[PDB]
Design a protein around this ligand. Structure first.
Ligand code: VG8
Length: 258
């Protein structure tokens, strides 16, 4: 029963924009029971029926998943204007957070984020769901010690893509692993984007030349080794997400010790 009464929803300030409409933060109210912070996806052209079924298929996608580190679907409002109500990640996007809290985040917290995400990505792997859009822009922050993948609906990213995805549009879990590799780099770089000033066309020639993103300052050797394994040109030599989870677990413990 995912159908929600509109009167239980209070719309608040706008937090972003999707292909279908604006995203708002708001409150979901309930007798008893305080008040739940939620993200509310809206829909400018949900007037038509084709657009409505495209918009709602996004709700359906999230409903398939139940994981601590993936944003949860709360419900839908299926009269006009059609709304999808997601759980809120109060602290916002990962990139803005890393740039702002650059000087109050120890290396231990950045590794935590990379691990948490990898648990989520291992879950999606075990379900055989290929994300295709793993990038820091798409990670959200619930609290200081908790990141989550945002709505897949709201998420070509040439600079993030595996070679075989670029060259042959083959998107698989091993291509997700590459993308995750890029993402771990963004995190360690405190929200800096890969291949700054480099045009999307220059990207692939450089990846085939062997060029990989540099080791971030202060990045522990073993973690960058793992990143370089995510960027094995041949996708069968790349480690699976369950492998990454067990390595990021030991790496993190090692750093929680310093
Ligand atoms: C305070 O709550 C906020 C505020 C600002 C952003 C996010 C946020 N928390 C959310 N909590 C849950 C959800 Cl489902 C959510 N939805 C998003 C809300 C916003 C975004 N953004 C994508 C990046 C956008 N922006 C970032 C840099 C400037 C240009 C592009 C604008 C924000 C995203 C969202 C998402 O799921 N993905 C994958 C990206 N936001």
């Amino acid at each position: 029963d995912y159908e929600i009464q509109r009167e239980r929803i209070e719309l608040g300030r706008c937090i972003g924009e999707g292909q279908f409409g604006d995203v708002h933060q708001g409150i979901y109210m309930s007798p008893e029971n305080p008040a739940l912070a939620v993200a509310i996806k809206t829909c400018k052209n949900c007037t038509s029926d084709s657009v409505r079924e495209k918009f709602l298929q996004e709700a359906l996608t999230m409903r398939q998943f139940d994981h601590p580190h993936i944003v949860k679907l709360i419900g839908v409002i299926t009269e006009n204007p059609v709304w999808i109500i997601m759980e809120l990640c109060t602290l916002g996007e990962l990139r803005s957070f890393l740039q702002v809290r650059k000087y109050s985040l120890d290396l231990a917290s950045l590794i935590l984020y990379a691990y948490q995400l990898s648990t989520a990505l291992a879950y999606l792997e075990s379900k055989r769901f290929v994300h295709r859009d793993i990038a820091a822009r798409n990670v959200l922050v619930s609290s200081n010690d908790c990141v989550k993948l945002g709505d897949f609906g709201l998420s070509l990213p040439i600079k993030w893509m595996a070679p075989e995805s670029i060259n042959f549009r083959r998107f698989t879990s091993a291509s997700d692993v590459w993308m995750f590799g890029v993402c771990m780099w963004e995190i360690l770089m405190h929200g800096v984007k890969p291949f700054q000033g480099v045009k999307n066309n220059d990207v692939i020639g450089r990846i085939e030349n062997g060029e990989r993103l540099p080791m971030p300052p202060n990045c522990p050797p073993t973690l960058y080794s793992l990143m370089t394994k995510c960027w094995a040109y041949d996708p069968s030599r790349r480690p699976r997400f369950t492998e990454l989870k067990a390595q990021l677990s030991t790496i993190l413990e090692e750093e929680k010790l310093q």
